[PDB]
Subunit: 117 residues, 2 copies
């Protein structure tokens, strides 16, 4: 499942020690910037999609996890940050499903060092 | 998987004999009204979502399946028609993922005769 981040140690483990070679999606949200239910359902489908089996989805309340928010200098939610091997690959402001899927596909291509798509 | 409709008999079987109690989603498309790749990927996720396990997704090229198009008086693609037990429940013009998921959820509620959500 999508993992809800509520602790700094937990976050560190999931983004480093346990991240391996997987793309890590950091989703920043707040109660005042909550996406409608239908939208949430669309993203739930994306997270459950079998082709993203190897992508780690981390959900972070930016107001409740201020240390993490400040670390990434979060300036607008909703927001996504895609990481790989301890570095940020791409960022995306907003929750447009199409834009997110594009960004995710771009990141998958970026980390395939053997064949250029 | 999503089933691509290319024959009238096939369509009849899937929408009646074999439809049972399941919600049947009719997706009408054409090559001149093709949704971008990212969008297609979003809908692919929705179709693969485990909570829609019991929904039948039928994809129909409106230009190549003129008899079906004419039957439903298709006047704008992309387009969706959700059927249940041989009757149309709801229709939706366009391919807004959020709007589609809403319409699908509404239909699921409509066919639960035992509990009103």
């Amino acid at each position: 499942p999508v993992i809800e981040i509520n602790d700094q140690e937990q976050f560190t483990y999931l983004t480093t020690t346990a991240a391996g070679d997987k793309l890590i999606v950091l989703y920043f949200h707040t109660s005042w910037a909550e996406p409608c239910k239908a939208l949430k359902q669309v993203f739930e489908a994306i997270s459950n999609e079998p082709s993203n089996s190897n992508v780690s989805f981390l959900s972070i309340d930016a107001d409740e996890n201020s240390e993490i928010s400040e670390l990434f200098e979060i300036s607008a939610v909703p927001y996504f940050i895609i990481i790989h091997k301890g570095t940020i690959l791409k960022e995306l402001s907003g929750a447009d499903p199409k834009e997110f899927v594009s960004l995710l596909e771009d990141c998958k291509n970026s980390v395939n060092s053997l064949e250029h798509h």
